């Protein structure tokens, strides 16, 4: 530890005030929205809600492309296949369901139901069209083969429930954050844990890779967001405000990695300059907890879902 | 007007999808969510089976072949007069001394959220049993923030039982701590609390040989009366209410009760009545 990150970026120009306005508002969910995932095309997005509905939406025109009825209304996570053919949903039923969007009878039907975990599914993220990695409240992360239907790898080092998962850009490493305040970097091919980080003092509810892939950020029930390097193997910064005392539901980066956007239980989202750790903007549209925050692959917009059942696109 | 021919067809699809969402929401709100909390009595999970027999649902031979292995597993688990000092199945004597009875008393832990739909008087409810979750409740308790009622099930014959795994801790004091912790939750501030007291018959026999005063010093009654013990226990539970304005509905269930559904309806109807009175500023 030669120096702190804030000492090196002391002589850098501040971002300045960030102003973002709702350019769209997606209405239709009738219950709390728990999860959202943008598509790779950067126009389509999927969102999951407790009324038992998974909805694919066109962002540009606010049009609803697809509406999928789920078997278990208790869903906590949502994912969109990088190709665009598939969506995955899971929740308190302990099953990860894969549905196909580009099927030839017009309807969206379930392709496979992956049932190996004993705890609730908290996150799932497609690795290819045939490989998905899921995190569970049973303290274990599993890498599956969608065609066969069997989990090829299990990551078991965690002691508390795993709440969030994030895949590296190269899709060879991922990081998981757990209820024991530890985040672990897991190698997907070997199946072991390369590193563990323990800077937080309460449950980690959110985790996200920096665009470079050599860093990541966590958000916890304690109000702080923490940035952790992978090569230095140490915490770099903490993003906290005396006024902020609520939990952090979701965290995500900007395309350049200069802005870190975090969704809070104070009903509003914050935008931090990730290199000076000083708050730069707010997103105050929602009137309930901001449950999901996702930025696009090109950085054009930021969608925020919430427990008031509306999604909002900001730019 | 600025839209193309295909853009207009896309908007027509988004309008049909909106119509279907609204119709689904209309269908959904006519259902009332009841959250059954998992205690040690609920962990045993025999009361739910017996109440199911009362509804009329039964077991085919296939289902009983399902429970064969569980029966044998239970004999071994129990084996591996002084029941109250340690943890033991309630039905060890009957086994050591499959029929429908054998099916009923196979104490089995449950994997995840199990939902029971039941319809009474044009009102349909869903009983969401969360007993077998076995994961941090701080991370999934919000899901049921908005529910009509949080049902609880505690046994009346639990006052003398001290479990071996605890270091001399009374099981009833454990159920009281759980009850207080749940009802103090800010998520359920708008939700009714229903409490069911079970094992009514087992108390009628247990009270004669076991004095409640020995385990709880406050009790001052006949010392051989089950009626006085029941009322004292219900008083201990109801006293935990931290509001004093919210009702805590109660019932004494004997495992042969055929009024557990009617009571749940009458408690839900009165929950709704009070919510209405509060919103119309009458109360």
């Amino acid at each position, epitope marked *: 530890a030669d120096a702190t990150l804030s000492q090196i970026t002391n002589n850098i120009d501040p971002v300045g005030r960030i102003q973002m306005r709702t350019r769209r508002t997606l209405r239709g969910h009738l219950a709390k929205i728990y999860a959202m995932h943008w598509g790779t095309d950067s126009r*389509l997005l999927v969102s999951a809600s407790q009324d038992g509905k998974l909805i694919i939406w066109d962002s540009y025109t606010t049009n609803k492309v697809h509406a999928i009825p789920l078997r278990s209304s208790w869903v906590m996570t949502c994912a969109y296949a990088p190709s665009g053919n598939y969506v995955a949903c899971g929740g308190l039923d302990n099953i990860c369901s894969i549905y196909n969007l580009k099927t030839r009878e*017009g*309807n969206v039907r379930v392709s496979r139901e992956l049932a190996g975990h004993t705890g609730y599914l908290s996150c799932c993220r497609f690795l290819d069209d045939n490989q998905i990695v899921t995190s569970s409240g049973d303290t274990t992360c599993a890498l599956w083969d969608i065609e066969t239907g069997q989990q090829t790898t299990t990551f078991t080092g965690h002691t508390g429930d795993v709440m969030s998962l994030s895949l590296a850009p190269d899709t060879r490493l991922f990081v998981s954050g757990a209820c024991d305040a530890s985040a672990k970097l897991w190698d997907v091919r070997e199946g072991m844990c390369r590193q563990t980080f323990t800077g937080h003092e309460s449950d980690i509810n959110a985790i996200c890779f920096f665009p470079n892939g050599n860093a990541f950020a966590t958000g916890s029930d304690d109000a702080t967001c923490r940035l952790f390097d992978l090569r230095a193997d140490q915490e770099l910064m903490t993003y906290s405000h005396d006024n902020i005392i609520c939990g952090i539901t979701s965290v995500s980066f900007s395309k350049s990695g200069r802005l870190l956007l975090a969704g809070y239980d104070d009903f509003n989202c914050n935008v931090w300059d990730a290199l000076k750790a000083d708050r730069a903007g707010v997103l105050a549209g929602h009137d309930n907890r901001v449950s999901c925050l996702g930025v696009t692959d090109d950085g054009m917009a930021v969608a925020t879902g919430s427990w008031d059942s509306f999604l909002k696109i900001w730019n | 007007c600025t839209l193309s*021919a*295909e853009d207009k067809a*896309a908007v027509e699809r988004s309008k049909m999808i909106d119509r279907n969402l609204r119709e689904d929401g209309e269908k959904a709100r006519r259902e009332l969510k009841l959250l059954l909390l998992g205690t040690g009595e609920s962990g045993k999970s025999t009361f739910i089976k017996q109440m199911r027999i009362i509804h009329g649902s039964g077991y085919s031979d296939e289902d009983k072949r399902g429970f064969t292995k569980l029966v044998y597993q239970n004999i071994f688990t129990a084996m591996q007069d002084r029941r109250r000092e340690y943890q033991l199945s309630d039905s060890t004597k009957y086994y050591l001394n499959p029929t429908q009875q054998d099916v009923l008393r196979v104490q089995v832990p449950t994997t995840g959220i199990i939902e029971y739909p039941f319809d009474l008087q044009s009102v349909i409810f869903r009983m969401v049993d969360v007993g077998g979750l076995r994961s941090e409740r701080r991370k999934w308790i919000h899901c049921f923030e908005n529910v009509t009622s949080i049902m609880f099930l505690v046994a009346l014959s639990e006052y003398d039982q001290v479990l071996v795994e605890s270091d001399n801790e009374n099981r009833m004091e454990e159920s009281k701590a759980l009850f207080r912790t749940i009802i103090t939750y800010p998520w359920f501030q708008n939700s009714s609390v229903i409490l069911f007291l079970n094992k009514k018959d087992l108390l009628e026999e247990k009270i004669m040989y076991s004095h409640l005063v020995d385990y709880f010093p406050e009790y001052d009654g006949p010392q051989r009366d089950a009626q006085a013990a029941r009322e004292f226990i219900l008083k201990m539970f109801v006293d935990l209410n931290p509001d004093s304005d919210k009702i805590i509905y109660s019932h004494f269930t004997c495992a042969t009760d055929t009024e557990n559904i009617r009571f749940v309806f009458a408690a839900v109807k009165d929950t709704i009545l009070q919510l209405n009175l509060k919103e119309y500023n009458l109360v």
Partner: single-chain antibody
Framework: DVQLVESGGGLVQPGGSRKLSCSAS????????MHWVRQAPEKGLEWVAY????????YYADTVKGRFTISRDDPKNTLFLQMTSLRSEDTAMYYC??????????????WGQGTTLTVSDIVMTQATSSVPVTPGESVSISCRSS???????????LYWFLQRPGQSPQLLIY???NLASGVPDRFSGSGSGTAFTLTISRLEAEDVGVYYC?????????FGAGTKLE
């Protein structure tokens, strides 16, 4: 899998009325809009009618508007086309065509076998009708439009179909570049606002047939004359 099988054609005395019907199988019929298209005995093919998903929208061809009626029994999975006051321009082969419209879909992807009926805006032009080419040589077909088919949304609404002798039309390319599912990567499409070109590299015997361009920017849905490869 997906089958549309129409029925109701035959020999009709002039001035009578006939009702056609396509029965659908193997797909979510209720979520598909439908078209009727018709082909003259020896000429190209022309759009006839379009009923929307949920029946909210109906468009008829100016030629038959007011004498034709289109209806769909979504529960029974059928599509009907009532025809009254049968003129002698109604001798044609009637093909049921399903199409679905959302961001990224491929309309006109499946066509039906067709029924024979015998009774006793934008113009799209292809200035060629016979190009005999040996297998193994690149073939470029051209098609021109009256106005720009490029909309403000950046989409150029030109579709390319193929008609094999004794077979129903089949979609090759939609919106000027995209390839339909199940077509070989040999077929490619590239066009300016008013001029469009379809190129078939490594020609094979299966490619021989009549190629039709079509527009979807406005609702006349005007096809082309067709370019034939022999």
């Amino acid at each position: 899998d997906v089958q549309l099988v129409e029925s109701g054609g035959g020999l009709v005395q002039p001035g009578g009325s006939r009702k056609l019907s396509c029965s659908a199988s193997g797909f979510a019929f209720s979520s598909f809009g439908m078209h009727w298209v018709r082909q003259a005995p020896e000429k190209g093919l022309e759009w006839v009618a379009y009923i929307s998903s949920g029946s909210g929208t109906i468009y008829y061809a100016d030629t038959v508007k007011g004498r034709f009626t289109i209806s769909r029994d979504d529960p029974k999975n059928t599509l009907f086309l009532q025809m009254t006051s049968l003129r002698s321009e109604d001798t044609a082969m009637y093909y049921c065509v399903r199409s679905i419209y959302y961001y990224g879909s491929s309309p006109f992807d499946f066509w039906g076998q067709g029924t024979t009926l015998t009774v006793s805006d934008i113009v799209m032009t292809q200035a060629t009708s016979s190009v005999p080419v040996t297998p193994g040589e690149s073939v470029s077909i051209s098609c021109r439009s009256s106005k720009s088919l490029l909309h403000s949304n950046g989409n150029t609404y030109l579709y390319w179909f193929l008609q094999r002798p004794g077979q129903s039309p089949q979609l090759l390319i939609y919106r000027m570049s995209n390839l339909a599912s199940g077509v070989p990567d040999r077929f490619s499409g590239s066009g300016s606002g008013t001029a469009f070109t379809l190129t078939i590299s490594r020609l094979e015997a299966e490619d021989v047939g009549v190629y039709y361009c079509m527009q979807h920017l406005e609702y006349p849905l005007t096809f082309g004359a067709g370019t034939k490869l022999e």
